[PDB]
Amino acid sequence: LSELVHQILKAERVVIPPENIRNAYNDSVHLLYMLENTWIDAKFILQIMCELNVLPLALQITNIAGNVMSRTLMGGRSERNEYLLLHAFTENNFIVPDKPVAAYAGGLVLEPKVGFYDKFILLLDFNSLYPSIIQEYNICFTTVHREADEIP
């Protein structure tokens, strides 16, 4: 929480030692300070929530995918894509699979010419490479002919 407050809200949060909470029951001022520290922690949590737009972004992602909001806010990526494809296939008159009850080559990294370059270097990057590959070459379940480790 301290690091999150430091990096997002740009504020300093005081820490109550675990061994001092028990001893704080010896003066009214200290007990009130402890309660106010809890209040300030709650305020920090709410401010962090507001800053990142956790709730609106969760709603947008849930609407795009189609899962339940609590699942979206619990983290993870598999459920979102699972429900996205479930909706896409069901809408198009398909029978979806049944819920379950370095394995292949990846990208290519060119061998660099390590050194120092004092002139302009031009970086050319592809826009949404893999999604655009799926679109361009029409890679899908219903298009590629698989056979139950060779490239189709």
Partner: protein
């Protein structure tokens, strides 16, 4: 003095007699270091033996307020920490560290019980106070000559002994190891109640021990041979015989059977030892075992040690922990020290000058001179 009368008098004193201005001058040390007074630990002992620590204050006004509000029975000063003690709960574990504190010594008459004959336990009398009179001279000289500590405040503990606060900036930055080294260097009488011979000097007398024996000698005849009479009868001089080799013991006994005065017996013992040479230091070992100060290394080793505050009130004797002027040490009398009851009687018999009308004034004056010296050192430097 009636200790049931303590709860009646404590507020008035803390309201109109406790020297808060000079107290803040002391613990604030000229404001040079920021947060110095604000990071100082205090501890209070209230009625019914209720103890509280990690008390810190923003400035003199806050201290005066919270003290007059609590009316504590005991005030102890502690270390200056890395942060304010009041917020120690807020400091991340391991980041709350005691960083600076005066170097302090506690000399307690109770630790001399096996070697004094006039009183026992918490009883003191004019015949035994000379021991404290010796200690202050033996120790303070070392602190002024061997270590070069220049600002030293000696304070009566209220009943059984004396404290010393060594407040030089160098002495306040000493680590735990350096403090333990200082304590062991000053310490000679080593051992508990189970050991009889507590001093075993080597063949070579270290200059410090020579100067401590020189200081002891000036007083020894009055303290040990006249007042204490450590050779009055057999039950006592048997001890001193027990402190020397058996070879001459018999030779001494017959001599002690023909002596009428303990001064005569001391002369005889010195002559016999001189006649008997590696034992030429045995009389010095006896003098040290009867006169040299005993120091609890645990009191001075730890940085986090809470020691009785100056100008405290002793829960039992009622005397004020007053500073002792080094020059007038020979005139100091622990029985004439103002009690809280006397100074409240004096107060209710006549704003920032009320204490000048009580018997407390010369002791606040000594404290003010000590603080003036500290201020001169802070400036000149």
């Amino acid at each position: 003095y009636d200790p049931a009368s303590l709860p009646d008098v404590l507020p008035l004193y803390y309201r109109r007699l406790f020297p808060f201005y000079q107290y803040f001058r002391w613990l604030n040390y000229g404001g040079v270091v920021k947060n110095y007074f604000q990071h100082r630990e205090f501890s209070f002992t209230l009625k019914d033996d209720v103890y509280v620590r990690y008390q810190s204050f923003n400035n003199q006004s806050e201290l005066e307020k919270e003290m007059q509000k609590m009316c504590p029975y005991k005030i102890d000063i502690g270390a200056v920490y890395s942060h304010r003690p009041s917020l120690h709960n807020t400091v991340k574990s391991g980041t709350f560290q005691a960083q600076e504190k005066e170097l302090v010594f506690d000399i307690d008459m109770t630790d001399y019980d096996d070697v004094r004959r006039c009183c026992s336990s918490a009883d003191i009398c004019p015949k035994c106070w000379t021991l404290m009179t010796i200690a202050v001279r033996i120790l303070d000289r070392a602190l002024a000559e061997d270590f070069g500590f220049k600002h030293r405040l000696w304070v009566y503990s209220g009943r059984r002994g004396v404290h010393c606060w060594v407040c030089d900036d160098s002495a306040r930055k000493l680590s735990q190891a350096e403090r333990s080294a200082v304590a062991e260097y000053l310490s000679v009488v080593k051992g508990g109640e189970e050991t009889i011979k507590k001093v075993q000097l080597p063949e070579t007398i270290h200059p410090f021990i020579g100067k401590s024996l020189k200081m002891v000698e000036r007083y020894f005849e009055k303290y040990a041979l006249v007042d204490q009479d450590i050779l009055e009868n057999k039950q006592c001089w048997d001890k001193v015989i027990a402190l020397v080799p058996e070879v001459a013991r018999e030779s001494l006994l017959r001599e002690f059977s023909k002596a009428r005065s303990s001064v005569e017996r001391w002369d005889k013992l010195s002559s016999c030892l001189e006649a008997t040479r590696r034992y030429s230091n045995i009389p010095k070992e006896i003098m040290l075992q009867f006169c040299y100060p005993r120091l609890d290394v645990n009191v001075s080793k730890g940085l986090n040690h809470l020691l009785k505050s100056p100008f405290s009130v002793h829960p039992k004797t009622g005397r004020i922990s007053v500073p002792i002027d080094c020059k007038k040490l020979d005139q100091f009398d622990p029985f004439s020290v103002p009690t809280i009851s006397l100074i409240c009687s004096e107060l209710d018999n006549v704003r920032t000058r009320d204490y000048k009308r009580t018997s407390l004034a010369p002791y606040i004056k000594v404290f003010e001179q000590f603080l003036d010296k500290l201020d001169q050192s802070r400036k000149g430097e």
